[PDB]
Amino acid sequence: AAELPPLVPEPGDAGQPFPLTPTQQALWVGRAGCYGYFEWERPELDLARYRRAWERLVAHHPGLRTVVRPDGTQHVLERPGPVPITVEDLRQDPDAVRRLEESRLDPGTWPMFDLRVVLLSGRVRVQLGIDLQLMDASSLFLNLFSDLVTLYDDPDAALASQKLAFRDFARWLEEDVRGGARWRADWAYWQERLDGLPPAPDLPAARKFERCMVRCPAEEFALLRERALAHGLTETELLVGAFAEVLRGWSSDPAFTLNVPVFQRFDVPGIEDVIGDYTNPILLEARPEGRTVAERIVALAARLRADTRHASVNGVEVLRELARRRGLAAAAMPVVVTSLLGLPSAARSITEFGTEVHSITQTPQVSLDFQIRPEDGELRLVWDHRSGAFAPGVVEGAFEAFLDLVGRMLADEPGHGVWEAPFADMRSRRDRAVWNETNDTAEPVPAVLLQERFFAQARRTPDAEAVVASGLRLTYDELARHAYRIGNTLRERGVRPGDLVGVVMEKGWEQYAAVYGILAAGGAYLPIDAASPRGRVARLLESAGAGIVLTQSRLRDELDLPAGTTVLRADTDFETASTAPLTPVQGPDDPAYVIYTSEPKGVVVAHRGVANLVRDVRRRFAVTPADRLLALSGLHFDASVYDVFGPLACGATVVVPPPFRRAEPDVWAELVRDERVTFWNSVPVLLELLVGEAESRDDRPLATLRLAVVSGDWIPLDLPGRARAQAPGLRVVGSGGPTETICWSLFHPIDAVDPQWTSIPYGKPIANQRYYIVDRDLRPRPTWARGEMAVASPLGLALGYLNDPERTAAKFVTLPGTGERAYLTGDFGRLLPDGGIEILGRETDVGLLAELVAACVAELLGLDEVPTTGNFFRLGGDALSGTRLASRLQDLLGAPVPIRTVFGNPVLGDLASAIAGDPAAGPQAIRVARL
Amino acid sequence: AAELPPLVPEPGDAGQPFPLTPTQQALWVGRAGCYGYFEWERPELDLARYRRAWERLVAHHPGLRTVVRPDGTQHVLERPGPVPITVEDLRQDPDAVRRLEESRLDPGTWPMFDLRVVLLSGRVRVQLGIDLQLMDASSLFLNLFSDLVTLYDDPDAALASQKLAFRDFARWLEEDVRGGARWRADWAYWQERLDGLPPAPDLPAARKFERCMVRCPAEEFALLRERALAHGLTETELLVGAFAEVLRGWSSDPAFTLNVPVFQRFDVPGIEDVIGDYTNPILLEARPEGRTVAERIVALAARLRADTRHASVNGVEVLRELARRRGLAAAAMPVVVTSLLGLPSAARSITEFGTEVHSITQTPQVSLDFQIRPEDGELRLVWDHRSGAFAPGVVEGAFEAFLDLVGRMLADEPGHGVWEAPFADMRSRRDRAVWNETNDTAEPVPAVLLQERFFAQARRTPDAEAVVASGLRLTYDELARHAYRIGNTLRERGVRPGDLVGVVMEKGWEQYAAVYGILAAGGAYLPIDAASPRGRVARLLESAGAGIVLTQSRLRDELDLPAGTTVLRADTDFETASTAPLTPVQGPDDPAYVIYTSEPKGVVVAHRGVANLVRDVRRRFAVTPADRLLALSGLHFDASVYDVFGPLACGATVVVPPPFRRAEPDVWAELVRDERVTFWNSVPVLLELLVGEAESRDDRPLATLRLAVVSGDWIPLDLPGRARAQAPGLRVVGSGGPTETICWSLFHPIDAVDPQWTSIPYGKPIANQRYYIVDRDLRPRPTWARGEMAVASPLGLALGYLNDPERTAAKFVTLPGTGERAYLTGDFGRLLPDGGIEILGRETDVGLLAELVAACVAELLGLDEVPTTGNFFRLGGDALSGTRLASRLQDLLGAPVPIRTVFGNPVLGDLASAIAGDPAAGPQAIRVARL
């Protein structure tokens, strides 16, 4: 604990220039609003006594006579002149409050404050505008406001004599403390920690200062003090920790750095009466360390206390180094906790002068400022936030969660209740009601197997068109008969419930016959791309255990299938089989198919979940037998699952396009025209290609499109309008959901595209699906908070991964709060106020000098190698060895390397640049570096 | 003509540090070989007298005792010590010259020279290595070498006493001349001109110093002097101008800047005896200004004289500014002319000491150094060039052209012969013999019309396959009969020789029938893409005057053809026409087709030129009836022209692919396999796609390919090897030529791909074509010189552009040297030593300060606006107004802006940066700039 040099006052230069404090300098350049404003009301004001009070305050306090020169230094005017006090008479004007509410200052001009008095009928408004660069918050309340009350009572009152000038204190910090023994030790503390500091809270952002606030009465203030002492904490530490709990409810990452200023006057004798700027912003690293609320708050407080023990370094300097390393944006710390607790008591309080009526601090570079201030026996808790910094509702939701959390702290005995809770739910009342409303989706799904629904439809409308595929029109009865031929044959050859049968085909009617025949037989189909490379088809079939494959005779010869495999050709090997109806032998929760995705995993899906999809789509989009769907997607993709089971369940027509290995929009646009397609289903880019093709044509070939469902990628913002142009009355519908949620698991009908959107909303869940946005502990997040989409359903999820229960256990989890089975999509998004989801992400001279510095550092620290990008103090340096570093470099270079240069450039590359840029050492140093 | 300050010698500091000259500084940093070397032979050498001579030289001349300190300053050692002279005894070793030839120095060590003496049987070799930083060339010959001869005769000889030190001269230039009155005027001269200076000669580059040299005897030296005086020139000016003529024969641009050093000693009394570095590289702008050789040389000399009148600025400084503006690469001036003419006579010459046996200057940063030196009544002309800086043969070719040009100057009276020539051909004897051999391509083309060749082939092999097109095999007789049906019908409907008939079809046999029917009728066909947008088809037909169109019935309805047009469908509207042979009524030089290219131009091509192409390809690639060509290219592209006329002229088979609007390599690879295609023709990328498709397959579906001709884009370097892998024995052949040279006009058979190539060679011309590489005056260039390809032929060119004789006259020009008609391709390339062609190209604080400087400059100069990028002196400034500029900026900024700062930063943005970076003015200046 290295003691600090003493302060020697220098009154002969009291009027001489002196530098801005580090925090005053930041406001000087950072304004180029920046002011505080206060308004009190009283029945009467004696203006003569009020002017005498301010004339005495200005005379007594040099800080009220300090002005900034154009060159960024400041000095104390000796006799600035009469105090400006603007009086405005409104005692005659009716609706005077509206006339005064409709009337809403520079450091280079005196004064840096603004005094106004408004006379009204029966009352007076006193108004004080003050530049934030004039003094810090503690000088405002403990010095200015207290003396203003004392002097308005008696402008001749005795005031404690000024035993030093703030100009002395400011020079003492810059010349004697900064760079001295303790500063160097404290600087090493911060530099060891710097590259580990997390960013500022990353809170949800929107598309000038507002106020959330609350006042704790004296008896809850006393209870809050007991709750904090019970954990060994100050009230500030308790409130800072509670604030970090709440911010973690909305922040993208649980680790963040808060700006927690202290107002250290260093016990300099007399300094408690000197108006100045004592702000030292401490950069508090808030990583969650603890299982319970109490443990985390206690751990955070211990870090705050350690940081505070090293506060001879001013946080503005730590922020400067952070910006050198990361750039100015990533170094900004715009979330501040400003506590005025723990300061000396002031003689008088401004509440004895008038009842506060309006007040607002507009601070540059600050988005959220949590202010903690004692006011007349009560604890005032204020959140000042900048409008438009945060998504609508975020700050009000966080405040309501903060009051809830502090209230529980007052309600619960230490060691019980919220103190022991793993976490506090931060969702608002409205968050939960909207999410519950949107996710109240359970519906019973009748235990009818997928093929049984199709066969019943084939009995209903046996002569309607089922599959139209390239100059061939299969009727419902014809398709059912061939499915029966396949099913009887497969049953006879030993397929039993649970067996997988491969379907290796190209687009054509044989895919539809094969699927329904496999299901009729009792098995599940395993579709595999007939254009797979190498012997992928054989690897998937071997891995899946599928001993039978159905294919097309025109295709059998270009497939490498292992020799023990039964390979039947859908279109020739079944012509003599029975067409006798086959009777179902699997159950609704048995697999209907296995679809492989990116080792490749086999996604096993049951009949019940597909029936759910099909029933939801039919009702939601009014699918009828008149509809004609274009089956674009390949059988081995999830998206084809609706194409296979939806239209055929209700009597509509599947239009199968010719096989294609690259997009052919013109073929598809012709096919949409000629077969009068009503139902498009594809990834967004294929719809774009189709719409482009139509735009370049004179017929309107997409005019029969009434429904277009696109999913699996970002939807261009102009695509829906472009599609509706080529097809009036078309409903464009966004969808989504991985293979594990069974094709489509949510929808967003795109009825109109707000041009303020960055993307189309991802949508709301279909029947029997629930879309949670969860944090890393699988707990649901408030509105706007980014998290992973977890899709919960007891029937609309895949059964799991084929033969892989360990990966099934990792992705199909039990949500902790409800015990629901949920699938972790790996996609990220956030909940929207209307219940929808926004998807966010789908699943060399100096160089030689630097090597020299690095090698010299490596030997000094005892390390093999040391990178030129390393921070000297993080690599293992400290105060005394950083001094040895300056000497070893002086020796080896033959040039002067001051100690200030090593400490001012902890990053080894930055030290090289500082040495090479030094006129007194540069050329010499570069010569030695060149060997 | 502002006089210069006087030189005041300062002998009290003769041993004190002093700076390197600007040219010495460049060598100091620019070495980090750099030396000169000399070797003379004499029968005897008296080593005692030789050592005494060098000990006297070293004592007498401070420059021989000057060393560079590690900090880049230099000083004069007082007593450096005995002169090192290494003696090597080889009088016993046999083959001693080989032992001495196998034995081939730092400024910080003394001496900066290297003295050796080699004793051999009967003779001695004296060897002198000298650092280029020690002294300039004029000090070497006029001071060192002359005094070495004087002193070896008598080491006690009287020498002119040193009346000053080179250290005085070097300080006088840096402190008194530089920055003074005349320097500022000269600096304004250069700065006005700087941004206009062309780059260094851009000469052809290759994939450590060599010597071309010649010695003019005294009587030709005297004649050369008379030739120069006859034009008012010095011999140096004559030789510099002749050198610029020759360099223009190879350089990519006719304008270049040469580095022409002068060795000015400024008539300082005594300085003619002082060894030092007097080099001032003058940057000579060599733009051709004149109709004849004489006029251009006279104009260039007048610029050299003007430049020389402003040589108080050292060219190293002009080069520094040029590099600030353009970067270091584009500012380098590595082509130097070093003349030692016009200097005082030296008392003795090194030729009196020994016969020179070997000498070489290795200069950093120099690629070609033309040295002009008087030697014992003769004129020595030396080209020192760096090996590998230039393409092989370029420097030897330029030297031979230079000797030829100077020889003509000695042969011709002024006012006659070469003096009056518009230009001198610079091609070497070998250049012309190779080009003539390669371009001796004339062959008579028999007057047989294109359709007559096909009809004769249809009589020869009437049952062979002509066109195989998508499940349809047209025989030669079947194709001839349908061509006759079309031709008789078109003849009957009024087609006469000269008429154009549109062909608007998609790939299919109807294109082949339509072409031969139109030709049989007597007209020319005009193919137009059936997939053209909008009403392009109607615009082209209207523009071309084509009143008839043939199309396909399956296609007629999607075409917008104007109403007065006859539209006949090849496949239905001709079934009842006569198949009687029709007799030809056009001639071989009448149009066969019109093909439109990028307003669009109609390229009109006659029968004769197509017969030339077809006959050349048949012989060159041995096309026989067994061959089967894949007609990939569209009829409306040039590349299809061979497909239409080549195979059918000799009995081979055209395999037509299905129409395609995007590449389908797999279809094409199938089609190559199934129809046994032997002849591929396409742009390179389509062959790449086809080869990729085959690589991914197990059959070798391209195995029947024996010939692949690719043209129209860069050929990837690995494509030929990749194609030969998929098809052993395949000949890959590169081709090229625009539509105006009738499909293919040159070939390069790619038999093996040198991995040192950056591209495949473009090739050599086919029969009746000649490929010239011409400069901007349409004159042929030497080997390696970049120029425009001009394709000359009286029959292998298009007749011209349809209805557009003015554009025909601009692109189909008469070459000036031969009167040949040639087509200017707009492509660029260069001739290769083997006769081929390589194609080269196919057809904000400072910001505010800167605005402040600019506005102040704009008012001072009287201009409305002035850009921040402008050079103050080019915008209109000069010496006196640049001084006024420093004062106006001092006034308006309130900060000191020294005059040196305005002159050291002529570019207004650079002045802003210098002011903003000045500690004594920066912060103030930035404040004012911010308004």
PDB file of C-alpha atoms in Angstrom, chain A residues 70-72 661-667 927, chain B residues 70-72 661-667 927:
ATOM      1  CA  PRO A  70     -10.135  27.780 -26.392  1.00  0.00           C
ATOM      2  CA  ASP A  71      -6.931  25.636 -26.069  1.00  0.00           C
ATOM      3  CA  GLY A  72      -8.630  23.138 -23.726  1.00  0.00           C
ATOM      4  CA  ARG A 661     -29.941 -30.987 -61.287  1.00  0.00           C
ATOM      5  CA  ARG A 662     -29.990 -27.179 -61.576  1.00  0.00           C
ATOM      6  CA  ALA A 663     -32.767 -24.624 -61.233  1.00  0.00           C
ATOM      7  CA  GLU A 664     -34.952 -24.274 -64.342  1.00  0.00           C
ATOM      8  CA  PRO A 665     -37.356 -21.389 -63.561  1.00  0.00           C
ATOM      9  CA  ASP A 666     -38.751 -21.261 -67.100  1.00  0.00           C
ATOM     10  CA  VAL A 667     -39.730 -24.937 -67.072  1.00  0.00           C
ATOM     11  CA  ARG A 927      19.318   0.698 -36.323  1.00  0.00           C
TER      12      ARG A 927
ATOM     13  CA  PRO B  70      26.450   4.372 -38.490  1.00  0.00           C
ATOM     14  CA  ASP B  71      23.995   7.342 -38.146  1.00  0.00           C
ATOM     15  CA  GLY B  72      24.121   8.105 -41.889  1.00  0.00           C
ATOM     16  CA  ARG B 661     -30.638 -21.658 -72.059  1.00  0.00           C
ATOM     17  CA  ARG B 662     -28.001 -22.612 -69.466  1.00  0.00           C
ATOM     18  CA  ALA B 663     -24.995 -24.913 -69.604  1.00  0.00           C
ATOM     19  CA  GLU B 664     -25.845 -28.612 -69.198  1.00  0.00           C
ATOM     20  CA  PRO B 665     -22.462 -30.417 -69.107  1.00  0.00           C
ATOM     21  CA  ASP B 666     -23.995 -33.774 -68.175  1.00  0.00           C
ATOM     22  CA  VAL B 667     -26.345 -33.769 -71.167  1.00  0.00           C
ATOM     23  CA  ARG B 927      -9.154  24.670 -34.036  1.00  0.00           C
TER      24      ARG B 927
END
